[PDB]
C-alpha cells in the first residue's frame with residue numbers, strides 16, 4: 380500500500396542521458412547517481428593446469444539510486460532494461476530492496492508522501 | 495528487540511560539521527560519507543539539473559532510529575532547495591571485523 | 602540460509618588488503634563486485650571529538666554463494682586487530698535483474 384522501494388542500477392557510463400529522459404516520462408522526479416568502480420573476478424588455469432589464479436579486472440561504473448512509491452517498480456526496472464540493454468557485458472544489473480521510511484527534510488513529511 | 499537499521503541521508507554538502515556534534519551527542523560512534531550527485535527530472539520532453547550532494551550512512555541499533563532521523567531533520571533544514579531526503583531500511587546482520595562480534599553488539 | 606534469497610554484503614574498511622581480498626572472494630565463487638572510495642568519520646564524547654579517515658567500500662550481491670562464506674572470508678583477510686578494520690552490513694535484496702540477458706533472481710547473478 381504505502382510501500383516504498385529503492386531501485387539500484389549499476390551499469391557502464393552510457394545512455395544515462397537517454398535513461399533520464401524515459402524515466403521522466405513514466406513519473407520519476409529525482410534520482411541519485413555516483414561514479415564508482417566495478418571489478419570482474421574470473422577463475423583461470425595457471426599454466427599447465429597446475430592451479431587457479433583469479434583474473435582481476437577493474438572498470439568504471441555508474442551507480443544510480445531511485446527510490447519510488449507511486450511509480451511502480453516494474454516500470455522503472457523495465458524502462459531501464461530497455462535503454463541500457465546492448466548485449467555486451469557491462470550492461471549491468473538492477474537490485475531492488477525495500478525502504479522502511481522516507482523523510483523529506485525541507486518539508487518534514489514522512490512515508491510515501493515525502494517522495 | 496535488537497533491530498538494526500541503516501539511515502541514508504542525501505543532502506547538499508553543507509552544515510556537515512554541526513550534524514556531527516548533534517549525532518555524537520546522541521550516541522553515534524562513527525558514520526560513513528561520500529560525495530554523490532542528484533538531478534531532477536521533469537517534462538514529453540525531459541529537462542534535468544545536476545547538483546553535488548553528500549551521502550551520509552549511519553548504521554544503528556541501540557541509538558534509536560527515530561532519534562537519528564529527526565536529529566538529522568532538525569539540523570539540516572533550511573526550506574531552500576537541496577535539503578534533500580532520508581532513506582531508512584532494515585539490516586539483517588552486522589559483523590565487527592576486529593572483534594568478531596555479530597548482531598547489535600557489533601556496532 | 603535458503604534458496605531464492607539474495608543478500609547485499611556491504612563492507613566498509615581500510616583501503617589496505619583489498620587485493621588479497623579480491624583474490625579470495627574470487628575463489629569462493631564471486632564473479633563481480635562494486636567498490637568506491639568513501640570516507641569514515643569517528644565520533645567521541647569527551648563536547649565531541651571528530652575524526653576523518655579514508656575508507657574503502659565493497660558491495661557484493663550474492664545468492665548461490667553463501668553469505669556466511671563471504672563474511673568469514675572477509676573477517677579473515679581484513680582483520681588486523683587494530684581499529685579501522687571496519688564493519689560488514691548485510692541486508693536482503695527483493696530481486697535482481699540482469700540487464701543484458703533479462704534474467705531475474707539467483708540465475709541473474
Ligand SMILES: Nc1ncnc2c1ncn2[C@@H]1O[C@H](COP(=O)(O)OP(=O)(O)OP(=O)(O)O)[C@@H](O)[C@H]1O
Nearest residue numbers: 389417468469470471472632633634635660661662
Ligand atoms: N553481483 C554483483 N554485486 C555487486 N555489484 C555488481 C554485481 N554484478 C555487477 N555489479 C556491478 O555492475 C557492473 C556491471 O556488471 P555486469 O552486470 O555487466 O556483470 P558482468 O561482469 O558482465 O557478468 P557477471 O554476471 O558474470 O557478473 C559491474 O562492473 C559491477 O560494478
Ligand SMILES: Nc1ncnc2c1ncn2[C@@H]1O[C@H](COP(=O)(O)OP(=O)(O)OP(=O)(O)O)[C@@H](O)[C@H]1O
Nearest residue numbers: 409410411444445446504531532533534576578579
Ligand atoms: N526518489 C529519489 N530517489 C533517489 N534520490 C533522491 C530521490 N529524491 C531525492 N533524492 C536525492 O535527494 C536530493 C535532494 O533533492 P530534493 O529534495 O531537492 O529533490 P526534489 O524532488 O528535486 O525536490 P522537491 O522534493 O523539493 O521537489 C536529490 O538531488 C537527490 O540526490
Ligand SMILES: Nc1ncnc2c1ncn2[C@@H]1O[C@H](COP(=O)(O)OP(=O)(O)OP(=O)(O)O)[C@@H](O)[C@H]1O
Nearest residue numbers: 523524525526552553613641642684685686687688
Ligand atoms: N555504525 C556505522 N555506520 C556506518 N558506517 C560505519 C559504522 N561503523 C563503522 N563504519 C565505517 O567503517 C569504518 C571502519 O570503522 P571501524 O569498524 O574500524 O569502527 P571504529 O570507528 O574503529 O570504532 P567503532 O567500533 O566505535 O565504530 C568507519 O570509519 C566508517 O567509515
